[PDB]
Amino acid sequence: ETCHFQAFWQALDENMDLLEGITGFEDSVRKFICHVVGITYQHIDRWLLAEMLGDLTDSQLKMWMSKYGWSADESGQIFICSQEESIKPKNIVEKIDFDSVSSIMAS
Amino acid sequence: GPHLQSMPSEQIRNQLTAMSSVLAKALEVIKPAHILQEKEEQHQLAVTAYLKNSRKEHQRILARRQTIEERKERLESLNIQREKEELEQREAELQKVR
Amino acid sequence: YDLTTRIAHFLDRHLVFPLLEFLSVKEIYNEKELLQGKLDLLSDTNMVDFAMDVYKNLYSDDIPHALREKRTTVVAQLKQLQAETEPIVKMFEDPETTRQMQSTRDGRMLFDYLADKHGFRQEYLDTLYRYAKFQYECGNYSGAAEYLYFFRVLVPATDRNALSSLWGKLASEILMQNWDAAMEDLTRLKETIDNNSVSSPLQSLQQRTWLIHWSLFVFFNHPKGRDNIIDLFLYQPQYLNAIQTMCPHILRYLTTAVITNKDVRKRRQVLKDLVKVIQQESYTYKDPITEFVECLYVNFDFDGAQKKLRECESVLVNDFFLVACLEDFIENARLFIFETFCRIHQCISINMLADKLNMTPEEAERWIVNLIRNARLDAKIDSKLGHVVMGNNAVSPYQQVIEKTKSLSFRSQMLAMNI
Amino acid sequence: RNTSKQQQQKHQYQQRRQQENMQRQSRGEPPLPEEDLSKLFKPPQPPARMDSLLIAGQINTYCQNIKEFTAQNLGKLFMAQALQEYNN
Amino acid sequence: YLVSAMLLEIPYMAAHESDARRRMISKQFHHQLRVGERQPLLGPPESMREHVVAASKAMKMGDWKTCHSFIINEKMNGKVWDLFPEADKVRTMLVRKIQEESLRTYLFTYSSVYDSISMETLSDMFELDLPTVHSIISKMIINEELMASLDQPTQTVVMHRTEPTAQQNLALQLAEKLGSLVENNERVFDH
Amino acid sequence: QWLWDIIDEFIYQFQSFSQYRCKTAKKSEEEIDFLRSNPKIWNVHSVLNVLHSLVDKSNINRQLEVYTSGGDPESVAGEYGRHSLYKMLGYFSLVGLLRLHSLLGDYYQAIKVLENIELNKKSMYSRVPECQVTTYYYVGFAYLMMRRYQDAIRVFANILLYIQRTKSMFQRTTYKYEMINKQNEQMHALLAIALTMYPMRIDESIHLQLREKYGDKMLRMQKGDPQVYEELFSYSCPKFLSPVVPNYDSVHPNYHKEPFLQQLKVFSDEVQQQAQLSTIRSFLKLYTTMPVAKLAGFLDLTEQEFRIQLLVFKHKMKNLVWTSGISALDGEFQSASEVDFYIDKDMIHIADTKVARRYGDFFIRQIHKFEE
């Protein structure tokens, strides 16, 4: 919830076979990690995205790289999102409410 | 009050673009036009028609409004007579009460 | 004021115990040493603060008053003279007297135990008479004075004795550095003067000065004392009408007590009713530091202000006077002005700021970022320049009235609509 | 507002003081008057409802709402025309 | 008396007629100026009253120049000047106050028109110096509660405070707001 | 004894009427038709529905919060008392929505909420302000629970405004008039803590008498004192759950504080870290794209040495309250500063003001009716 993903995979005890026993649980949490990465990163480093997903190898990271279409950039981060595509402001633009206001002020 | 020759530049104030778009576009369709003058020559024909209807009605209004005019001097005077003469009827009647 | 028609007759004829005298020819900064020569007399001989001067700048002019005290310890004075290599041959009278005091004591000490033992009033009050007699002869006999006034402070002639005795105690206990016992008189002396006698000015104004005394030094939370004393004899920077009285550090320490421990809302109350009044008009002609601290501030100078403010802090660090909040003033003397300067501002440089107060621009930056963190200004840094920008021109105040002026009437017409 | 002020003060605020004076009398003296008690309320000019504002003034509230409703309208038309005309 | 009040009240009414009016007080120099103001026929002043009215009009216009007329000439007439060895002092006291408050009366009107100000101009023009004009404009924008942003090192103001239609809008906003407030008295009387 | 003479006689009279409710609504047309005719007010028929919403909830909350074992109260009411009345065919009037919003109220105190979906779907009949303000009451609370702070804060604004054109008049919010004032006040105060550098809509919702005190509360809460965590949470609890009556406070019966362990500590977890989200946003975002000067200026501000400044910084950007990007070669932190909107109040007022004109013009034309 507080999105301490580094601490999440550290915190894990690996002797609790129930947490192995839930099918797709280990990937589901990873898919939620990468889900929130897309909402609030424009880029992420290759080593950084690995560590958040439980210190992945080069080959293990190929799945997560391909999943949302993400790909390498020069020296040497993984692209996540375009800068204008992430932010999405819906701020100051109104005072275009003429039509309704004149329809009620019509008589 | 100005103190100088009129040379204002163009500025936009309330009902400028409104009433400009009414009349400035109107003038273009008035001064050159091959579409207007035919319509107005047939509006002319509906105007002739109304005076033509009128001169028939005028001949009846020459009888009818003559009978209104002359009687309206008598009748409407006699009505406002009774309006003002009622103040006497208000007075001498109420005197009879007490 | 209304007591001042009465103070008008008297014309400054107050009743100090060392009478006029303190240390002679002096060399250092002078509005400092003002208040020491003041409170030398008004406190009945200070002690430690003989030597508190002599530390920074040597004198042998502390020695005359260092002959003349007996209630701190007789022999402590009898050494400081000998140390200055002075023949002083005929010291044969304090060995006579304060010896025979002990012969007298063996009565009262005996009577004292036996009475509080029995719990018997008469034997304790005749003791209290014998013992309240005794303790002003020499108050060293240190704890004995505290013991004497522990059970009963109501002596045969209550207030007149009690006043001069609790004052003799508040005096001597601060000199003994027994600040727990002095804090006991912080309760009781101020209550005694609030149970005022005749209320003649020579009494009242001296008593008002004795309130400035316990608040001076600092043991615990004398800023509570500040909030208590300011709501007594109300809202005057001396408490003493007629403009003769001059106490610089009553207002400096009040300025410290306001800002370092509370909001400054709350300091423009001070800026009116303590920084402009009849007593303080006199004062504004005089003291350099406390003038710069407020006059520059309220005029909304920044250039001469933050320079001459920063200059005050050289004279502050020269203070060996008892204060114990000396550096939080140095802190806030820079903070307080800055907020006010930047309040209506467009664009100030962190670099110009850092040249002035003699810090690095990084320090000044994180300082500014912490002034904005604390939300004492709404501003934002032009990082590229290292300039900081306030820019609220806040136009269109129309809407502020419009919601409530109808929401009032809508719900207030409901009243007359009811019945 | 100042018409209503003074009249509402004669209506209630004066009744407030004189009835609290009627307290002091104890509302009856049996042997003899009751001069004071009688000479409480002695007429100020409005006892309620000053009419010429209530009628004739209110005909001009109507006319002032009309002037406002008039001056508004041609404004409303421009606020359509201006935006729209430039929108092309 | 009439001159003491003058420096207090002409900025005050300059502020008022820039729609800060609710502080308009009768039976004061306002009245004493009013009775002299309402002369249809004044040309040159030849009475001490009229010299006060004369300097008052100059203060409204905000020209220092008009202050100096009555302070020199009517004080020779009149020998208001010639009864003090301290008229020398009181000259300087009158002058710099006029130059500061005339600047203030000027600013109370003109500040809609501004986008910015060379504060250096004001110092040169009203015959004042920058240390004081700093402190003046600083005090002003704090306590007169202006919507100016004030760059004191750069010697620049950036203001942009609108609107000329506001003079009507705030006035009917007041005319409106006055409605509910008296109305609550009409309620509290009634009940 | 007088206590449970009143309590038991409510429930036994409601259990009586519950059979009449089910019997009349579904099938007996002529009995409904006979009831339409005789009185001058059908208000007597309808009030008794949501009259028994809040009175029954009181009586069942007492029995709930006295018997904590061998549960008689909660399964009797849940099965019979609630679902029999609501699940089957509605009575033809506003009674269909009354029994709906009585059920929505009953469903609210129980912390099982997910059928708020279908309760809105079965609110087919038109949203009268009476039913609508009480819908937005719970629907806003549902959004408050959904962690849709920005949505719920708008929903609380309208219902506290008092120009939803309420007039009441004849006791349809009776004895709880100021509960609608203080609960909407309170629950809106929590939402302001979470997000706000956006509204700029709090002007409409809460009046300046309360905005001043609640304004400084949020600041004092997030910045410098966990004191406001206490006093806010004290007032928030009776209003979050709405437990209509707390039982008689005495130490000789226990019986009552045991349910209040759960009820309270359930809401502890809510405001716990949702408050600590606030302080991160509290420091104003001074320079929109931060170079080394401002990024280090903010990492000096987050936490000190050494260990683990960057980690904690990049944990907290994730949650919802930052949108940003890291650059490797530059070493640059670029971020998103978004703002709301100035005046949305005027154009919403333009009709509201005209209602002050309208009911002005109307009410005096009702007096002009009478004294003419």
Spatial strand order in the sheet of C347-349 = C347-349, C387-389, C380-382
Ramachandran region of residue C199, left (φ > 0), alpha (ψ -120 to 50) or beta?
A: left
Check CB contact of D1 with chain E, cutoff 8 Å.
yes
- DSSP notation for chain A: ----HHHHHHH--SS-TTTTSSTTHHHHHHHHHHHHHHHH-SEE-HHHHHHHTTS--TTTHHHHHHHTT--B-TTSPEE---HHHHH----S-----HHHHHHHTT-
E74: left (phi over 0), alpha (psi -120 to 50) or beta: alpha
Do the chains contact at C345 and E151, CB–CB below 8 Å? yes
CB F216 within 8 A of CB C372: no
Could you tell me if F349 and C403 are in contact, meaning their C-beta atoms sit under 8 angstroms apart? yes
Cα-Cα-Cα-Cα torsion C233, C238, C240, C243, nearest 10 degrees, comes to -150
Distance CA C250, CA C222 (A): 12
Q: How many CB atoms lie within 10 A of CB A38?
A: 14
Residues of E with CB under 8 A from a CB of C: 131, 134-135, 138-139, 141-142, 147-154, 156-163, 169-170, 173, 176-177, 179-180, 183-184, 187, 190-191
Within 13 Å, how many C-alpha atoms sit on residue F117's CB side?
Answer: 3
The resolution, in Å, is: 3.6
User: Going edge to edge, which strands form the sheet with F324-326?
Assistant: F289-290, F333-335, F324-326
End-to-end CA gap in chain A = 53
Chains contacting E with at least 3 CB pairs below 8 Å? C, D
d(Cα F341, Cα C203) in Å, to the nearest integer?
66
Angle at the Cα of A33 (from A66 to F325), degrees rounded to 5?
80
The answer for residues whose C-beta is within 8 angstroms of residue B46's C-beta and 6 or more apart is none
Q: How far is E159 from chain C (nearest CA, A)?
A: 7
The DSSP string of F212-277 is HHHHHHHHIIIII-SSHHHHHHHHHHHHHT--S-PPP--SS--SSHHHHHHHHHHHHHHHHHHHHT
Q: What angle do CA F157, F161, F165 make, to 5 degrees?
A: 125
Q: How far is residue C232's CA from residue C228's CA, in Å, rounded to a whole number?
A: 7
Contact flag D1-E179 (C-beta cutoff 8 Å): yes
Bridge partners for C387 per DSSP? C349, C382
Tokens found for residue F162? 């008092």
Contact F156, F188 (CB under 8 A): yes
Question: How far is residue F354's CA from residue F357's CA, in Å, rounded to a whole number?
Answer: 5
How close is the nearest chain E Cα to the Cα of C394, in Å? 7
CB atoms within 10 A of CB F190: 24
Select from F210, F195, F214 the least CA-distant residue to F144.
Answer: F195
Distances from the Cα of C112 to the Cα of C104, C142, C149, C157, F296, angstroms: 13, 16, 12, 19, 71
Those residues whose C-beta lies under 8 Å from the C-beta of residue F204, and which sit 6 or more positions away, are C403, F157, F161, F345, F348
Distance of CA E189 to the CA centre of its chain: 39
> Which residues are CB-neighbours of F368 under 8 A, at least 6 positions away?
none
- Technique behind the model: cryo-EM
Q: At residue C288, what is the residue type?
A: P
Contacting residues for C213 by C-beta, under 8 A, at least 6 apart: C39, C42, C43, C170, C174
Interface of B with D (CB under 8 A): 12, 14-15, 17-18, 21
Nearest in space to C159 (alpha carbons), one of C191, C182, C137, C130: C191
F336/A89 CB distance under 8 A: yes
Looking at chain D, which residue has its C-alpha nearest residue B15?
A: D78
- What the block records as the tokens of D17 is 């003081």
The string of DSSP codes covering B29-81 is: HHSS-SSHHHHHHHHHHHHHHHHHHHHHHHHHHHHHHHHHHHHHHHHHHHHHH
Contact C408 E191 (CB under 8 A): no
| Residue whose tokens read 């100059």 | E58
Nearest-angstrom CA–CA distance, F185 and F208: 12
* Peptide bond between residue C176 and the one before it cis (omega within 30 degrees of 0): no
Rounded CA-CA distance C317/C311 in Å is: 11
Determine the Cα–Cα distance for residues C412 and F166; give it in Å rounded to an integer. Answer: 15
Residues 6+ apart with CB under 8 A from A72: A46, A78, A79
- Bridge partners (DSSP) of residue A4 are none
Q: Tokens in use for D74?
A: 């041609």
Return the amino acid letter for C152. Answer: R
What are F124's two structure tokens? 């087919």
Query: What are φ and ψ of residue D63, in 5° steps?
Result: -70, -30
| Cα(C66)–Cα(B3) distance, integer angstroms | 91
Smallest CA–CA distance from A76 into chain F, residue: F328
Within 8 A of E182 by CB-CB distance, chain C residues are none
**Alpha-carbon gap, residue A19 to A26, rounded angstroms:** 8
Angle between the N-to-C axes of helices F257-276 and F179-195, in degrees from 0 to 180, rounded to the nearest 10 = 40
Two tokens at E35? 């009775």
Contact C365 F297 (CB under 8 A): yes
Residue of C311, C307, C313 lying closest to C329 (CA atoms) = C313
Is cis: bond before A63, omega within 30 of 0?
Answer: no
Round to whole Å and give the CA distance between C89 and C76.
17
Contacts of F211 (CB under 8 A, 6+ apart): F202, F203
Contact F157, F201 (CB under 8 A): yes
Q: What is the DSSP letter of F372?
A: -
| C115-120 contacts at long range (C-beta below 8 A, 24 or more positions apart) | C116/C151
E30-63 burial code (b ≥16 CB/10 A, e <16): eebbeebeeeeeeeebeeebbbbbbbbbbbbebe
Q: Please report how many Cα atoms fall inside a 13 Å half-sphere around the Cα of residue E173, on the Cβ side.
A: 18
Cα B20 from Cα F321, distance rounded (Å): 51
Q: With an 8 Å Cβ cutoff, are D75 and B14 in contact?
A: yes
Residue C302: which of C366, C350, C353, C259 has the closest Cα? Answer: C353
The amino acid that residue E132 corresponds to is: T
Structure tokens at C330: 């140095």
Contact F284 C399 (CB under 8 A): no
Residue A41, phi then psi, degrees to nearest 5: -135, 145
F203:C373 CB<8 A: no
Distance CA F154, CA F188 (A): 9
E72 contacts E58 by C-beta, under 8 angstroms? no
Q: At what angle do helices F346-370 and C399-418 cross, to 10 degrees?
A: 20
What is d(CA C43, CA C174) in angstroms, rounded to the nearest whole number? Answer: 10
Cα distance from N-terminal residue to C-terminal residue, chain C: 55
DSSP-H helix ranges across C135-177: 142-151, 158-176
Place of tokens 């909420």: F113
Q: What's the 3-state SS for E51-64?
A: HHHHHHHHHHHCCC
Q: At what angle do helices F179-195 and F228-240 cross, to 10 degrees?
A: 130
Contact with chain E for residue D10, Cβ under 8 A: no
* Axis-axis angle for helices F179-195, F208-219 (nearest 10): 40
DSSP codes, F291-345: -HHHHHHHHHHH--SSSSHHHHHHHHSTTTT--EEE-SSS--EEE------S--S
Side-chain half-sphere exposure of B18, counting CA atoms within 13 A: 13
Q: Which of F160, F286, F346 best probes binding to C when mutated, by most C CB atoms within 10 angstroms?
A: F286
Interface mutation vs chain F, best among A2, A49, A83, most F CBs within 10 Å: A2
Element (H, E) at C382: strand C380-382
Instruction: Say if strands C380-382 and C387-389 run parallel, antiparallel, or are unpaired.
Output: antiparallel
Question: Roughly what angle, to the nearest 10 degrees, separates helices C201-214 and C222-229?
Answer: 150
For residues D58 and C291, give the distance between their C-alpha atoms in angstroms, rounded to a whole number: 63
Tell me if E161 and C300 make a contact (CB, 8 A cut-off): no
Measured CA to CA, the distance from residue F210 to residue C96 in angstroms comes to 76
CA angle C208, C209, C213 (to 5 degrees): 120
Residue E19's closest CA among E174, E184, E190?
Answer: E174
Helix or strand (DSSP H, E) at C389: strand C387-389
Give dist(CA D41, CA D61) in Å, integer: 34
Contacts of D78 (CB under 8 A, 6+ apart): B14, B15, B17, B18
Backbone breaks in chain F after residues (C–N over 2.5 Å): none
Give the residue numbers in D contacting A (CB under 8 Å), as ranges: 72, 76, 79-80, 83
Query: Which among D1, D2, D12 is the nearest to E190, CB-wise?
Result: D12
The string of DSSP codes covering C52-64 is: HHHTTS--SSSTT
Question: C304 and E131 in contact by Cβ < 8 A?
Answer: yes
Gap between the Cα atoms of F306 and C399, Å rounded = 49
Question: What's the CA gap between A40 and E94, in Å, rounded?
Answer: 66
Q: How far is the C-alpha of C385 from the C-alpha of C378, rounded, in Å? A: 19
Stretch (H or E) spanning F289: strand F289-290
Cα F365 to Cα F350: distance, rounded to the nearest angstrom? 23
Q: CA–CA separation, D58 vs D4, rounded Å? A: 14
Name A57's Cβ contacts closer than 8 Å, sequence gap at least 6.
A50
Q: C299 vs E190: CB contact, 8 Å cut-off? A: no
Which residue is it, tokens 């005909």?
A: D59
**Cβ count near C56 (within 10 Å):** 13
Which residue is closest to C361 within chain F, CA to CA? F293
At residue B27, what is the residue type?
Answer: L
Task: Check residue C212 and report its DSSP letter.
Answer: H
C-alpha A59/C-alpha B29 separation (Å) is 76
- Strand segments, DSSP code E, in D1-88 are none
How many other CB atoms sit within 10 Å of the CB of residue C17? 13
DSSP collapsed to 3 states, chain E: CCCHHHHHHHHHHHHHCCCCCCCCCCCCHHHHHHHHHCCCCCCCCCCHHHHHHHHHHHHHHCCCHHHHHHHHHHHHCCCCHHHCCCHHHHHHHHHHHHHHHHHHHHHHHHCCCCCEEEHHHHHHHCCCCHHHHHHHHHHHHHHCCCCCEEECCCCEEECCCCCCCHHHHHHHHHHHHHHHHHHHHHHHHHC
To the nearest whole Å, the CA of D43 is away from the closest chain A CA by 47
Distance CA C289, CA C304 (A): 13
| Cα F229 from chain centre | 19
Helix (H, G, I), strand (E, B) or coil at F172: coil
Give CA–CA dist C230/C399, Å, rounded: 42
Instruction: Name the helix (H) or strand (E) containing C353.
Output: helix C350-356
